[PDB]
Amino acid sequence: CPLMVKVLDAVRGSPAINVAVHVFRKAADDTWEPFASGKTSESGELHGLTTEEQFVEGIYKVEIDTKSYWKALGISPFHEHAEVVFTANDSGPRRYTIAALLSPYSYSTTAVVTN
Amino acid sequence: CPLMVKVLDAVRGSPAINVAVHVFRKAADDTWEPFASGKTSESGELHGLTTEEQFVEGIYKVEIDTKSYWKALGISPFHEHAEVVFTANDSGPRRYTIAALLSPYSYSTTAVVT
Amino acid sequence: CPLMVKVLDAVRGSPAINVAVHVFRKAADDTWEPFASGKTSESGELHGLTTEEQFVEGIYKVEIDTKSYWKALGISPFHEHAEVVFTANDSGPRRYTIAALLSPYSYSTTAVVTN
Amino acid sequence: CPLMVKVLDAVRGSPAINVAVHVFRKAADDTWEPFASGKTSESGELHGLTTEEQFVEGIYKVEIDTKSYWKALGISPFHEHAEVVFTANDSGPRRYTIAALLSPYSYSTTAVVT
Numbered sequence: 001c002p003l004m005v006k007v008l009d010a011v012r013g014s015p016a017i018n019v020a021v022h023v024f025r026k027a028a029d030d031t032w033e034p035f036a037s038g039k040t041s042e043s044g045e046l047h048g049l050t051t052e053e054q055f056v057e058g059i060y061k062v063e064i065d066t067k068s069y070w071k072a073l074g075i076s077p078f079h080e081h082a083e084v085v086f087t088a089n090d091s092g093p094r095r096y097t098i099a100a101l102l103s104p105y106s107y108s109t110t111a112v113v114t115n
Numbered sequence: 116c117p118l119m120v121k122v123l124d125a126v127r128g129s130p131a132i133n134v135a136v137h138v139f140r141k142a143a144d145d146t147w148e149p150f151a152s153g154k155t156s157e158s159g160e161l162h163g164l165t166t167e168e169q170f171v172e173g174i175y176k177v178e179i180d181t182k183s184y185w186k187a188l189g190i191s192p193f194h195e196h197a198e199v200v201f202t203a204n205d206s207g208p209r210r211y212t213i214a215a216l217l218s219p220y221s222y223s224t225t226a227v228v229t
Numbered sequence: 230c231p232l233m234v235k236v237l238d239a240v241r242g243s244p245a246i247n248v249a250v251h252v253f254r255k256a257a258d259d260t261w262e263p264f265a266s267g268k269t270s271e272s273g274e275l276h277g278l279t280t281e282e283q284f285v286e287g288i289y290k291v292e293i294d295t296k297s298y299w300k301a302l303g304i305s306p307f308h309e310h311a312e313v314v315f316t317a318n319d320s321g322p323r324r325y326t327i328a329a330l331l332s333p334y335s336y337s338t339t340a341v342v343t344n
Numbered sequence: 345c346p347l348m349v350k351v352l353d354a355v356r357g358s359p360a361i362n363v364a365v366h367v368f369r370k371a372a373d374d375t376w377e378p379f380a381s382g383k384t385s386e387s388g389e390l391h392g393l394t395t396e397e398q399f400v401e402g403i404y405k406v407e408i409d410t411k412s413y414w415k416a417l418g419i420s421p422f423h424e425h426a427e428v429v430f431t432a433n434d435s436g437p438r439r440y441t442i443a444a445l446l447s448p449y450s451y452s453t454t455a456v457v458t
């Protein structure tokens with residue numbers, strides 16, 4: 001489990017459940033190719049997106065479908081989605097936890113990188 | 116205007132208007148004595164809280180009544196209020212802008228010292 | 230484990246380890262009396278602060294000694310500390326996770342409340 | 345000034361100066377076409393990116409080159425950049441202020457629509 005995504009709801013004070021997450025990897029031609037996807041669980045977490053073998057060095061984009069999340073709650077959000085673009089494993093395999101705290105007109109994201 | 120407070124609403128995407136703000140200064144006996152207070156304007160800002168002469172070195176506490184703000188919007192907030200406690204150093208010309216971004220169960224605050 | 234504190238470092242992308250945390254409860258005379266204290270572990274978490282029996286309704290203040298944390302890293306922080314003041318269990322026992330993301334001149338805190 | 349960008353530094357407690365900002369608009373073919381660009385000023389702000397006439401309804405992407413900002417400070421950041429993607433509705437008079445608070449491994453962004 002080298003890549004983990006945690007999504008929290010700042011309005012309800014709870015995990016953001018069933019949020020669609022799409023992960024892409026930048027290909028040689030500067031194109032974003034689908035890498036993995038899933039939905040957050042009851043704990044607002046998404047595990048098992050990839051393996052150490054498949055998660056090679058590269059530029060990755062974690063796209064969180066925040067818009068659909070808020071719409072389902074009857075709130076008109078500002079953002080189309082939240083994106084986190086980062087270079088991974090450039091100096092060896094690391095464990096990445098990408099966390100996002102969501103509000104209708106704002107979001108905060110942080111990363112926790114472990115060995 | 117050595118001290119300025121800016122409050123934003125992360126739910127409505129607007130300035131947090133009419134939010135009560137109380138500023139205290141720590142006294143010699145470790146007690147918090149009232150220093151200044153006001154309410155944010157239409158731009159979610161609060162100016163003229165103090166002057167350079169009165170704003171001396173010390174420990175200050177900026178208390179933002181976030182609870183009343185959310186209650187007025189029909190939302191039950193988590194926090195009683197948001198507090199920002201800092202030491203106003205006074206080492207060279209400095210203006211302090213305390214900004215706070217509010218959500219019902221969360222708040223973020225930052226300081227811009229220029 | 231009705232009260233949990235999680236502290237993260239936004240500068241290093243890691244858990245904030247060994248951060249002193251003091252919890253107070255507002256007494257009848259509007260005074261803050263010591264309730265519990267501890268230091269965050271390697272995971273940036275602090276468990277076992279109290280029990281369901283002892284964690285009664287009331288106003289609590291979680292004080293995070295952020296200043297000492299940054300000083301130890303050779304960084305002069307803005308805040309003396311970070312405080313989170315909230316009413317707990319006013320409508321029955323709840324589980325509270327208080328999270329704080331720290332930066333030298335900024336901090337973000339959120340709460341996750343469970344049944 | 346229908347669109348304004350404000351960038352702050354959470355590590356130094358100051359405006360994020362000289363940060364490159366690129367704005368794109370989604371074209372009919374789902375492609376991102378350059379719309380405007382600039383660099384934040386001493387106040388960490390970027391004004392005059394567009395006009396009311398040119399800023400029509402559509403999906404816009406504000407890209408903040410955070411990586412270059414941190415590298416210049418001798419800090420290795422986590423993100424390649426920070427992006428803010430939103431639909432500019434155009435329902436009544438509206439000004440958009442996109443604010444971003446930057447940290448090496450974290451960033452927070454909010455929108456103030458007044």
Ligand SMILES: Oc1ccc(/C=C/c2cc(O)cc(O)c2)cc1
Pocket residue numbers: 006097099100101108109110223235237328329330337338339
């Ligand atoms: O502004 C904010 C941005 C991010 C966060 C993250 C919190 C968090 C808490 C956990 O227990 C586990 C985790 O992986 C992440 C909190 C506030």
